[PDB]
Design a binder for these strands. Sequence first.
RNA 1: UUUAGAAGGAGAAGUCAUUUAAUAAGGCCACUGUUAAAAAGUGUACCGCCGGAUAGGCGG
Lengths: 175, 293, 294, 245, 110
Amino acid sequence: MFSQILIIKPGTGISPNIIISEDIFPVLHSLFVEHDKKFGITFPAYSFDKKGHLGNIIEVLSEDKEALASLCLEEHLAEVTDYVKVKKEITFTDDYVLFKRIREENQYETTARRMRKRGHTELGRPLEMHIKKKNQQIFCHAYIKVKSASTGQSYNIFLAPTDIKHGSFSAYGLL
Amino acid sequence: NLSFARCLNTTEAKFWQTDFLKRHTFKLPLLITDKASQSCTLSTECDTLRIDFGIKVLPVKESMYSCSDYNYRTAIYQKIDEYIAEDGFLTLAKRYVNNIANARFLWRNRKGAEIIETIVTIEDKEYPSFNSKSFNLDTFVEDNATINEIAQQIADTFAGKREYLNIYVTCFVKIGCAMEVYPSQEMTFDDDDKGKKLFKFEGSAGMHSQKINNALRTIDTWYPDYTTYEFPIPVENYGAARSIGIPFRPDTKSFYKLIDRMILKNEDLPIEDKHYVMAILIRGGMFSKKQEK
Amino acid sequence: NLSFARCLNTTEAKFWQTDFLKRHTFKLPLLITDKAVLPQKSQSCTLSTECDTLRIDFGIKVLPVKESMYSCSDYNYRTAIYQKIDEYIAEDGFLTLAKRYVNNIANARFLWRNRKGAEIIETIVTIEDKEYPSFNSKSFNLDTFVEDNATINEIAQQIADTFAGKREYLNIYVTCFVKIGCAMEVYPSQEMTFDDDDKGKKLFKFEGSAGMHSQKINNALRTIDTWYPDYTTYEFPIPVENYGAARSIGIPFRPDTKSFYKLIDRMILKNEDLPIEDKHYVMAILIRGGMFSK
Amino acid sequence: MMKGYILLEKVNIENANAFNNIIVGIPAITSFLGFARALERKLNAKEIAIRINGVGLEFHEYELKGYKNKRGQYVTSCPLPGSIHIMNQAYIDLNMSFLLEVEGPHVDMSTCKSIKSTMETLRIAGGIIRNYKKIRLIDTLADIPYGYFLTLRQDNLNDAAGDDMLDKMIHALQQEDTLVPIAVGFKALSEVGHVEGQRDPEKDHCFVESIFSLGGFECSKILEDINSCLWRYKTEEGLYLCTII
Amino acid sequence: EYLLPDINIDELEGVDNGCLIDEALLPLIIDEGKRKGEGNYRPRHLRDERKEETVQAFLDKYGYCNIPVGYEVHHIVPLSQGGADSIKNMIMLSIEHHERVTEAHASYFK
RNA sequence: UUUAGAAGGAGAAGUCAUUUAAUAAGGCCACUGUUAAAAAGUGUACCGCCGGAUAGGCGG
């Protein structure tokens, strides 16, 4: 739908993955929770020859001009302006690609209690081997490392592109 | 076999743990925890990380090291004399003043931090406190209170009025408490430990001063297609950067053809071009012509 | 076939760390600290923290110039050289060369790169005691040679006495003090790297300290030359070599008609008389020594 | 109708006839020229209608089928004669490559499959194909791997001391070691008529003898020209020959 | 002639379908990268080519429709001291394992 | 349409014996190693659950 372009500036010797995973999303989660989770993020810089790549360009997707007008990222985010650059050029574009959230974490002792409690079966050769393979394919993907709030720990979030151009969003800006 | 030498000599930065209010006193060493990947962090008491390094300034034509031709030395001396009688080596000194002033040397410690303060002291005099957040990154502010007083001594030491200059720079970030700050690693020396090592000298951490040198060397805004990219670039032989991936001067604006048309042709190149050639002369290095191979 | 040993033998130096007020009392070793670049590793030595200045003490040995005359191939050559030596004693006295060498110590131009940017140099020499810090106290210049004073006269007179025939040895100590700065970069002599595994800046360390080579000092002590062609338009004294070729400039100053080959072809084998300017160079060659074959 | 060149890369041949007339080792170049002509005929039997004119040779490895006796001279091997005593033969294991100057329409991303299919019923100087490495159509000067090209250097063949070829060949051969004898085409006689006993009676028959010259080896990096190699057919009034001009 | 691994036949251990799944076996892969092809390095032009059959090799190695997005391709002596594109001389790896062995092989193949 | 087309290398064996190299020796003397550099990609990937198939999905 409606898109806003936001750019980063290479040349400082540091890749901006830390600056988009720590100085963008932990400070945007509060306004995502406040504003009923009606915004998304995307990038037209896919490069999956061997590893995951992000490029240097981010776009914020909203379904109406009022949301992008009332976001006003140029002024409230005036702390990392030496690295990020804002564009007050919100309009409608027909070249938007949507993104969904896919999550698959390790499940040995997270659900060992559930497997000894709810349903028990022999997990020696076939099934436990199914865990790490399920933790391998999604592993070979462009990830984002964020921080929790309840119990302090970091983890991996994988953002997969999709063809579903319409729908609702979540706290991470995905679905 | 023309080759200059550095007119800006760097000393290795050292990390010292420091509490909040007593920044001047109570400096403690910073040891590195070897974890299985060397890394370290600040403790629950000290919440200020100090950087101490030195810059030695020696004049440019006295920094000339190797030449197999007297006429090249005479032409270089004439060009330097014309630059002294034309500009006076003040703008490059002002740019190094701005680059040491804005605390651009910490690199990764700058992001995520607000309270960064540096103090630049001459051998007998110091300077007041600094607000290094207030400066920008892609500009060069050339009109302040004490900028002329701090830049004139460096300009005269570059020119030849003062034979020596010694600069002690001590800077510190203060806002974070029990956070982590990692020095530049010691490369892949021995692969017995596959993890990332850190910098260790004199029983502490610190910073490689090649990092500080390439921090202060990033003032070049005279490259071709400046309006397309719009940031300073370190003053290198080709102006190349390994981050963006595009060499900025693969053309006649690069140093080889520039100095060929400056010396072997005696061209009247404009002010920014001769600014670039005196910046790369200040940086120093192996400037010899290519042997016939 | 002819050879000449060194009329004077210096000492491969060391580096130590003192202060301005603890210059004679407190000393500390200066160790080489390795560094990483870019790849490669460079062993860039540096002055340690919590200092103010820099110690470097070595020793110089002076011996008579007729005793150091090495393996020759003719007794007539020895008599001719000794005849020129006693003529130089009778008309001058081997003391102008001593004055110029002690002035070369008195400008202390053996530090090379550590002279650049240095605050103060203090060369202390002990013939038997410390005469005066005058040596390198008042700043010198490489355009005039400082006559008068007293230490220059007495040390040049004793060095001339040891030079000609009046002594057999003299052992004095060049303990010079370079105030580079607090934790600044010190340039030691760099070892010639002969391996590509770690092809960085391999440096020269002493037995528990930072060192510097003897030829870094000895080749920087023969800087005296005011008797060479085109001195009036060059106006600086080049160091003394065989052909006179100075690699710092790249233009060979001497070997037009005043090199050592011309002097050895118009001397000794054929008897000719040459002036004081054409004799002080050829007697400053003998203090340096070398291999004068062919 | 566009001019190009194909590359037969790393063709290894066992038991190629290395005993042409006098030269043991490198065979006569007319073997490779007739191999290119047989490939041209095989492609002409198909309706591709593609012509080939020009061939250059790039040697990589060689194995004379024998060993060293005492000091360095070679002793060669042979199979057992049977139903119809041995008289004179020798064999070699070659590992060489071909440049074929290809002139004809519809060449780009084509005729390589036809060359691959028609190569399997071919012999290079009477030796088995086994497994050539690749067929390539890269149109650059620096399309050659690290091999050595056998060219026609008529410098010591032409200007040397000695009154005639015989009193000149060995004298031109002492001072240069890379230069080697090469059989270069063949012409002897006349009477081109239709006398019986021919392999094909509806052709021209002659009694022909081999002729010789010199050759040399140069690398892929250092070179002079494509026109200094890629040997060509030539014909005269009974003086059929192969040469580089 | 290029070497081959001495153990890769079928799903033995730590493996579901071709890919190295379980841990505590990468030392075995690192000593299979060792113990074969030491001191016998060849020049760059004396190396096995990378053929275009490899896409069909990933097609019919085990039944994959194409090259997986979540997996890569690796050998045990990559472009140094032997190794060829056979039917068995490839072991597909994970991101961390390939990143570790790119420096682990260069530790001895400096 | 190529000095094209074709071909069984075989079976068997004793190399053996002792043997003193050693005496003598001067590598030498002197030549500033210096200029200049980006190690760090984010260096780690947790629970509350609904789900009872270890399917798959919401929040901190």
